[PDB]
Design a protein around this ligand. Structure first.
Ligand code: ATP
Ligand code: MG
Length: 274
């Protein structure tokens, strides 16, 4: 179970926007750390909407199972604050924020080598999850957080972490799921209980498309009815103009879940490039 954090030890500062039934804030946590030393630590506070408190079990279940695993490319959760009427996840604050935002802001400056490094790191994280038979269920560029920027001067690559899953697609309303096409795979639109390890291979493909597409969101021009028909017609996403990962994207986004490559195979493919 999660460490319980007192509301009195948390200060809410600026809003970072809204997620799926959540409000996100930057905050400060006062804590006693190692050696009895007092700290004030920057934290990310995820607040489940009061109106959607029926989703709290899924909201926290997500975080919990993954926080039972420690991995360098997985975001650290510090604990929960369940004081009063609020349900709050207290998470590590990742300095450079979401990859999708970063891709759009720095697109002129991002090259294939940076992209490959980030893809490899994401694949490493997903391989670890696969090995542990843990389904993430919401792999996407917004849910990849940049801990550190590339520094050519020192040969340091960028470094990312994958955030928590959030409320499971197995409990979310149909209209939200449809809006999340083409991250949610076709079999999960058919039946959200089809959530499986193969789910994350599909979403990984979509995420690679994002990584190659400068922060663009695939199929954003299609309304929900048209996104449904896209899957009914068995279309694939267009190749990004920077096409180096296009074959890998299509191999991951295979309409037959059984044919989607293992993360081991994905990593081998990535290692074979530039
Ligand atoms: N750990 C973090 N550190 C720094 N910024 C973060 C962190 N997590 C989220 N953010 C910022 O908060 C914004 C909202 O995040 P996001 O949309 O993932 O919310 P969510 O509650 O996780 O919803 P979903 O389940 O849809 O992902 C993001 O764009 C991101 O920049
Ligand atoms: Mg998120």
């Amino acid at each position: 179970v999660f460490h319980k954090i007192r509301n009195e030890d948390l200060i809410f500062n600026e809003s970072l926007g809204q997620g799926t039934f959540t409000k996100i804030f930057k905050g400060v946590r006062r804590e006693v750390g190692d050696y009895g030393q007092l700290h004030e630590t920057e934290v990310l506070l995820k607040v489940l909407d009061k109106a959607h408190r029926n989703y709290s079990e899924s909201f926290f279940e997500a975080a919990s199972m993954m926080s039972k695993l420690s991995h360098k490319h997985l975001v650290l959760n510090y604990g929960v604050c369940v004081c009063g009427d609020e349900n709050i996840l207290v998470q590590e604050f990742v300095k450079f924020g979401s990859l999708d935002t970063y891709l759009k802001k720095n697109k002129n400056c991002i090259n294939i080598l940076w992209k490959l490094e980030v893809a490899k790191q994401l694949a490493a994280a997903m391989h670890f999850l696969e090995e542990n038979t843990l389904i993430h269920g919401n792999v996407c560029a917004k849910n990849i957080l940049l801990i550190r920027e590339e520094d050519r001067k020192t040969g340091n690559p960028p470094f990312i972490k994958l955030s928590d899953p959030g409320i499971s697609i197995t409990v979310l309303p149909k209209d939200i799921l449809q809006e999340r096409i083409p991250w949610v795979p076709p079999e999960c639109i058919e039946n959200p209980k089809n959530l499986n390890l193969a789910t994350d291979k599909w979403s990984f493909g979509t995420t690679l498309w994002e990584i190659c597409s400068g922060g663009d969101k695939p199929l954003s021009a299609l309304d929900s009815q048209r996104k449904l028909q896209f899957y009914e017609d068995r279309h694939q996403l267009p190749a990004p103009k920077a096409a180096e990962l296009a074959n890998l994207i299509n191999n991951c986004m295979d309409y037959e879940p059984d044919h989607r490559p293992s993360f081991r195979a994905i990593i081998r493919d990535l290692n074979s490039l530039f």
